[PDB]
Design goal:
- The protein has 144 residues and is of the alpha/beta class.
- It has helices at residues 20-31, 60-63, 79-89, 95-99, 133-142; strands at 9-14, 39-41, 53-54, 64-71, 100-104, 122-123.
- A 6-stranded parallel β-sheet has the order 3-2-1-4-5-6, sandwiched between helices.
- Helix 1 links the parallel strand 1 and strand 2 (39-41).
- The chain is globular and about 50 Å long.
- Bound molecules: magnesium ion.
- The site of magnesium ion has 2 residues, from loops.
- The modification Phosphoserine is found at residue 92.
- Residues 7-141 form the TIR domain.
- It is found in: Cytoplasm; Nucleus.
């Protein structure tokens, strides 16, 4: 009986503490789609009421198919961004679009991270794509 703890994950969610409220909203919404996503973060304890799992940093590239990147002005200054930027720069040609899913959720005064310049963004601020935003993100994350 019961629920298993995953060995491999659909995605790691990379975010700085300033953006935790967005991540809390995202996880609940993704859990309310017709998918059973396997999601991980550095510390599940700060995301109560969710099905997310904790993962050691050194295991992320090996065990996560993709990385969701929550981008904001605050994020650009964070150690979490340092980790994600190094991760992105470690990737071979073609791997960036296959493994990175950047999300914007509020206005930014700063330019988007250099390494994400050719990467498709999930823009939560655009009302024109809002109705199916979470469903489409969940489908994207569920794919190999
Ligand atoms: Mg909207």
């Amino acid at each position: 009986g019961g629920v298993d703890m995953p060995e491999r994950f659909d995605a790691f969610i990379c975010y700085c503490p300033s953006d935790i409220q967005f991540v809390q909203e995202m996880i609940r919404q993704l859990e309310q789609t017709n998918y059973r996503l396997k999601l991980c973060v550095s510390d599940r304890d700060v995301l109560p009421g969710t099905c997310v799992w904790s993962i050691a940093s050194e295991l992320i590239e090996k065990r996560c198919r993709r990385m969701v990147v929550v981008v904001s002005d605050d994020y650009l200054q964070s150690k979490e961004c340092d980790f994600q930027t190094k991760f992105a720069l470690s990737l071979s040609p073609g791997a960036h679009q296959k493994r990175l899913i950047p999300i914007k959720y509020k206005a930014m005064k700063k330019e988007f991270p250099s390494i994400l310049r050719f990467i498709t963004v999930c823009d939560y601020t655009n009302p024109c794509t809002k109705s199916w935003f979470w469903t489409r993100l969940a489908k994207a994350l569920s794919l190999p």
